[PDB]
Amino acid sequence: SVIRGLAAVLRQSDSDISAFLVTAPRKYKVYKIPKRTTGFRVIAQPAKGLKDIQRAFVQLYSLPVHDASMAYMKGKGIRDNAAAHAGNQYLLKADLEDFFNSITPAIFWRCIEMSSAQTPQFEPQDKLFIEKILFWQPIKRRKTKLILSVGAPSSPVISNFCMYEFDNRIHAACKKVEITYTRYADDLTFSSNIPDVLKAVPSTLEVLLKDLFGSALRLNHSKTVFSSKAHNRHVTGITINNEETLSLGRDRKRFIKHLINQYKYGLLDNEDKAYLIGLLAFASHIEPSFITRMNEKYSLELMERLRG
Amino acid sequence: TKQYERKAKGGNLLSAFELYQRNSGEWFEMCRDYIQDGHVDESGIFRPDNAFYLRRLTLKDFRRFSLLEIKLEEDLTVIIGNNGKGKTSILYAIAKTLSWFVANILKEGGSGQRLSEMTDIKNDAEDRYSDVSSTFFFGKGLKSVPIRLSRSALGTAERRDSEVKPAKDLADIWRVINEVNTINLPTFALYNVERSQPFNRNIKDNTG
Amino acid sequence: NIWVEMITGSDLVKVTNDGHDVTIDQLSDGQRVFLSLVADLARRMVMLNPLLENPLEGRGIVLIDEIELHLHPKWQQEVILNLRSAFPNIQFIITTHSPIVLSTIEKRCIREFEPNDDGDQSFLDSPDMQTKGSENAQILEQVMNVHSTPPGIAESHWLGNFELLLLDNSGELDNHSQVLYDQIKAHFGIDSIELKKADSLIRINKMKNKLNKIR
Amino acid sequence: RREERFDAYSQTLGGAGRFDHFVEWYIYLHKRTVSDISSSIKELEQQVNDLQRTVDGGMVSVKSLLEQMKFKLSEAIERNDAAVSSRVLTESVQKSIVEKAICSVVPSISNIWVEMITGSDLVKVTNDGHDVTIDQLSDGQRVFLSLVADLARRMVMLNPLLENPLEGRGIVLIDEIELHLHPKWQQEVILNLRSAFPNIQFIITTHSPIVLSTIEKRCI
Amino acid sequence: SWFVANILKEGGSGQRLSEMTDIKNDAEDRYSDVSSTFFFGKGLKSVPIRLSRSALGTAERRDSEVKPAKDLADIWRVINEVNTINLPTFALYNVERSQPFNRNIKDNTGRREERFDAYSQTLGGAGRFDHFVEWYIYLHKRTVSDISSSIKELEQQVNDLQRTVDGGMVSVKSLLEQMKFKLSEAIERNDAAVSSRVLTESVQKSIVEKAICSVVPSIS
RNA sequence: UAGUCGGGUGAUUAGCCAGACUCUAACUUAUUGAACGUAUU
Ligand SMILES: Nc1ncnc2c1ncn2[C@@H]1O[C@H](COP(=O)(O)OP(=O)(O)O)[C@@H](O)[C@H]1O
Ligand SMILES: [Mg+2]
């Protein structure tokens, strides 16, 4: 049935879809992306044919996603995520280890079985095809090891779904004690105005993860960080200032001003100029007041010239 | 790359070093100045602009500890408790972590020490593995150097990996910059109860 | 002072210890062990900091277990101060069982285990009391959770018992209170703090009783 | 060699004791307590008798084996007789005495026993309510355990005729009694030692006011 | 040493250059290299090996390149495991070979009989003439004895013991099991010896005697 | 005190000025994929 649906969407024969899917878990290009400090991340992108199938699958089958899930959601982003926590003085950040590569077919099917909200029902015959659509085989020789890849277009949807029940439980638990909770992919954020309530959250998380996923998904204990208005607070790259307003941060603002000053004297190269323009669009989205200030500081004419 | 250039010009040491390695003057001097710059305070004591110290330590299923976090002072931290509270365990955990800096200052890709699979995993831990996680500070240009040493208990079929690359990356800066132009290097030492020993002048070590 | 002699025909390191010239082999274990620590540390810093005017102002992390090992109380009062003076940019991470050592350190530097821990405590914390400049007996009780007087010795309770007897007999020395008084005097001596406290109790209680009778 | 009575004098005045000798001796005592020797003699006697009957029945090939078994039997009887001849305490009693001493004197230790783990004999201890190996003990606990265990071993070996062998005579020298001990243990250590070993003359050195608070000035 | 190590064990390590003694004192590059090229027929005209070592604190490490030697040694090891082949001899005889002889010689532990004892201490500098004497005496004893007679004798003893257990003497069952184990071990050793295609002890002895007498002029 | 937030100045990722904050307690991250902003259409 999954095959018939895909064939219809992609205007292909059932036979050619089925044939393609036989080796689909191996149809991934592996490459490296430089980290911002030193080193590399390894990424696996599906081949074009497989990407099309994956997108078709996601289109055909709507999986439930909790409102606390901020990543990969239409009309939501890092701004919304940060804004959720801006009014609270105390902050806790937690992180899940090897999040995407921890999600296996076993976890996926368990989540389907367990799910409260209306999950699509799949015929047993379709389960094998679904696994081949959604999961990557990193090791050629080991056909048994299938995992989600961050690089696949279906992986965001599947990962959010797999966290649905987790999000339900923890969100409900936090709401009872007046803690705000959001998740951006593998990044968990908790905030509150009550002192000495966030300390219990890490223990609660560990128990819940064990309950739902056993040993498959774990907290990165090194990445658990407490913060307050005594210290720097940021959520997904956005600084929350002490006036409870979203900010780019002083250093980034100073850097942007530097680039504008360079532009004013015709010192910016084309690459840097393009960079500056892009960054200003982001600044306009997070902190529009900053753009107003730059207009005041640098002449509206200069800024318009830049953005033209 | 332009991204590294921006970060490096912002004072990021790792970016400056990456640019130095790819082009191999400007960037070399940035790295060397980051390590060597400092000033003499009012008391006449030299103070490095970029201090190096252990900020935080986390122990998971290590010896007596199920999950323990310690925040350390930049200058002096004293740990107190009754016998058997794990004071020596804490020092051992730190010393093993520091061994990774020492090994890599001596030799590119050098190996530090390891947690014991016989003794170091907590006896009644349901997950049969242990983690020692440290974070080091080296000035505003390198605020966080995270290291994890891990070990699985002897029978266990899953094996838990250590994460030591950040230690190696920082130690590489010290080693490489020193080779080109001499710099001051950090001292790491452990003095445990084994420091009490009989003296024999007669015995001379002929190794190095 | 420390120096090398070769004239005997073998190389000997000698030291002036308490005004006497001795060999290293003749030092007490406490002196030798402490000398060893400092000598080793200084050597390494000199070798690793060739471009500093004072190489002992170099960077590093030094771990010392049981800093008070083999040290007389007199030395325990100096040891942390001396080390920090000599090595001002080293991060020291130390363990100790010595209240005397703690009396020389700020409370912010101290990390204390909870008394009935069982290895499930999440975060270590500093004591409530300020230790630096405090009396050793207070540190024993308030930080180390140990009585300043040994509870397992009967004589440690005699003053308490004496006071209770005095209060049971309306403040007058009865036969029983007199016996115990004599025991205190015999055991601790005529010039003891304990006897002075007993004397004080007698004086105060007699005067309180006189006031009560006047009323 | 660890079972020989005068092994009790082996590096007694060397300064460290021999805690390694204790562990060997203690495991030995455990193995002998699980294995009765006279039943082995009775079993060996029965085997010798069965083998003798086979040799008498014309099977000359097993004569070499009979001679070996007779030798083993004679050795077992001799050991039994030597044990009988030594008037020495039973291995079970020896074990119990030492265990009690250790648990009484060393505060963190409530129990000590021998486990067969995999194919090797291992001493285990209940330390602060948790079961651990000797190698897992803290330095302070181990050092003090070592002292008491060694001393108890030697006293048991040298005083076989006493109901309580730890009430034997002797002179014991201890340098820096407070070595590695927290203040709480310093308040109990002298009392515990003197209670366990009542007829030993102790000559000790200390830097601890806490230790001195438990001792009369005449002893100082 | 790298060939020998890998013939003996998969992943075996040979010896390494010293950072202290092997690097030239005034080397500008602050590393040392020992490069060798071996020949093994026209099918493998070049087997290169490099042993390297860098000074402490150099910016780059100099590692040894040993893979070709390991690959070749692996062929010898693996093929030999399946079907016995002849193996190469490596030996160093330094001036240390001039040493006095211990007249008193060790009882046959049984390590000297094992084929890969031939690689023991082969590059140490002195040889092992003590091992020769032990091995040669062993060879003599086996030549004067018969092999399999012990098995036949053991077979006869196990048969006699089996008859005794079948006759109702259950006490000797433990001894039967021990003897069956000894018999199985003897057969296995015999079979392993048979499987290893090793020359008869008599022939081995003859070859060596002839070699010695041929090469050493004073010895007939 | 210190650290943090950051409105201003400053050929400007620096420095300096101003104001404020303090649960034991931020360490600024990753693409070509996904989502979001802007441009293009
Ligand atoms: N693997 C282990 N599992 C559980 N407890 C352990 C383990 N290893 C050691 N311990 C316990 O930890 C304590 C060791 O204390 P130690 O680290 O030496 O601290 P201290 O120096 O303060 O005594 C003892 O109580 C010992 O029983
Ligand atoms: Mg992009």
Bridge-based pairing of strands C60-64 and B187-191 is: parallel
Stated as kind and residue range, the H or E segment containing A264 is helix A250-264
Measure the CA–CA gap between D22 and D123, rounded to whole angstroms: 11
Residue of chain A nearest B165, judged by CA positions:
A39
Amino acid at E59: A
Q: How many CB atoms lie within 10 A of CB D35?
A: 10
Q: Do D65 and E157 touch (CB under 8 A)?
A: yes
Measure the CA–CA gap between A238 and B185, rounded to whole angstroms: 37
With contact defined as beta carbons under 8 Å apart, do E109 and E116 qualify? Answer: no
Which segments of chain D does DSSP mark as H helices, in order?
19-34, 37-56, 63-86, 91-105, 139-158, 183-186, 189-196, 209-212
What distance lies between CA E12 and its chain's CA centroid? Answer: 14
With contact defined as beta carbons under 8 Å apart, do E161 and E43 qualify? Answer: no
What is the resolution of the experimental data for this entry, in Å?
2.6
DSSP code for C13: E
Q: List phi, psi (to 5°) of A78.
A: -65, -30
Q: How many CB atoms lie within 10 A of CB A120?
A: 13
Extract the tokens encoding B116: 């014991």
Q: Do A38 and B133 touch (CB under 8 A)?
A: no
Measure the CA–CA gap between E122 and E83, rounded to whole angstroms: 24
Extract the tokens encoding A250: 């002083």
Q: How many CB atoms lie within 10 A of CB A102?
A: 19
E195: buried, middle or exposed (CB in 10 Å: 19+, 13-18, 0-12)?
exposed
D61 contact residues in E (CB cutoff 8 A): 153, 156-157, 160
> Does residue B82's CB lie within 6 angstroms of at least one atom of ligand 1?
no
If we measure between CA atoms, which residue out of B205, B163, B191, B207 comes closest to residue B58?
B163
Rg (CA), chain B: 20
- Contact of B165 with chain A, judged by CB distance below 8 Å, is answered with yes
Measure the CA–CA gap between C2 and C21, rounded to whole angstroms: 9
SS3 D173: strand
> Does residue B91's CB lie within 6 angstroms of at least one atom of ligand 1?
no
- Ligand 1 atom closest to B64 (CA): 5
Measure the CA–CA gap between C22 and C67, rounded to whole angstroms: 25
CA distances from E129 to E14, E54, E132, E195, E217 (A): 23, 37, 5, 28, 19
D146: buried, middle or exposed (CB in 10 Å: 19+, 13-18, 0-12)?
buried
Measure the CA–CA gap between E113 and E189, rounded to whole angstroms: 11
- If DSSP states are collapsed to H, E and C, what string results for chain B? CHHHHHHHHCCCHHHHHHHHHHHCCHHHHHHHHHHHCEEECCCCCEEECCCEEEEEEEEEEECCEEEEEEECCCCEEEEECCCCCCHHHHHHHHHHHHHHHHHHHHCCCCCCCCCCCCCCECCCCCCCEEEEEEEEEECCCCCCEEEEEEEECCCCCCCCCCECHHHHHHHHHHHHHHHHCCCCCCEEEEECHHHCCCCCCCCCCCCC
Q: Which residue has the tokens 């060393």?
A: D106
Q: Measure CA of the first residue to CA of the last residue in chain D; give whole Å.
A: 40
Measure the CA–CA gap between D210 and C148, rounded to whole angstroms: 8
Chains with ≥3 CB–CB distances under 8 Å to B:
A, C, D, E
Q: List phi, psi (to 5°) of A178.
A: 65, 50
Extract the tokens encoding E20: 């202290």
If we measure between CA atoms, which residue out of C164, C152, C146 comes closest to residue C205?
C164
Q: Do E169 and D59 touch (CB under 8 A)?
A: no
Q: List phi, psi (to 5°) of D105.
A: -90, -35
Extract the tokens encoding C106: 């700020």
Extract the tokens encoding D68: 């070996």
Bridge-based pairing of strands C2-5 and C12-17 is: antiparallel
Measure the CA–CA gap between E98 and D161, rounded to whole angstroms: 60
CA distances from A227 to A93, A190, A247, E21 (A): 8, 10, 17, 55
Q: How would you label E103-125 residue by residue, b for 16+ Cβ within 10 Å and e otherwise?
A: eeeeeeeeebbeeeeebeeeeee
- Contact of D176 with chain C, judged by CB distance below 8 Å, is answered with yes
| Neighbouring residues of D175: CB distance < 8 A, sequence distance ≥ 6 | D204, D205
Q: Which residue has the tokens 């070990």?
A: B151
SS3 A64: coil
Inter-axis angle of helices B165-180 and B13-23, nearest 10: 60
Q: List phi, psi (to 5°) of E8.
A: -80, -40
Give A42's Cβ-side CA count (13 Å radius).
8
Bridge-based pairing of strands B76-80 and B65-71 is: unpaired
What distance lies between CA D151 and its chain's CA centroid? Answer: 9
If we measure between CA atoms, which residue out of A285, A193, A205 comes closest to residue A244?
A193
If we measure between CA atoms, which residue out of D117, D121, D125 comes closest to residue D142?
D125
Q: How big is the C-D interface in CB pairs under 8 Å?
A: 33
With contact defined as beta carbons under 8 Å apart, do D69 and D51 qualify? Answer: yes
For residue C4, list its beta bridge partners: C13
Bridge-based pairing of strands B76-80 and C110-112 is: parallel
DSSP code for C154: G
DSSP code for C152: T
Measure the CA–CA gap between E164 and E170, rounded to whole angstroms: 8
Measure the CA–CA gap between D11 and D23, rounded to whole angstroms: 16
Strand order in the sheet with A90-95: A180-184, A187-192, A90-95, A225-227
Please name the nucleotide lying closest to B137, CA to C1'.
F27
CA distances from C206 to A298, C192, C212, E38 (A): 90, 21, 10, 108
CA distances from D104 to B35, D112, D149 (A): 57, 12, 11
Measure the CA–CA gap between E123 and D209, rounded to whole angstroms: 63
Bridge-based pairing of strands C20-23 and C12-17 is: antiparallel
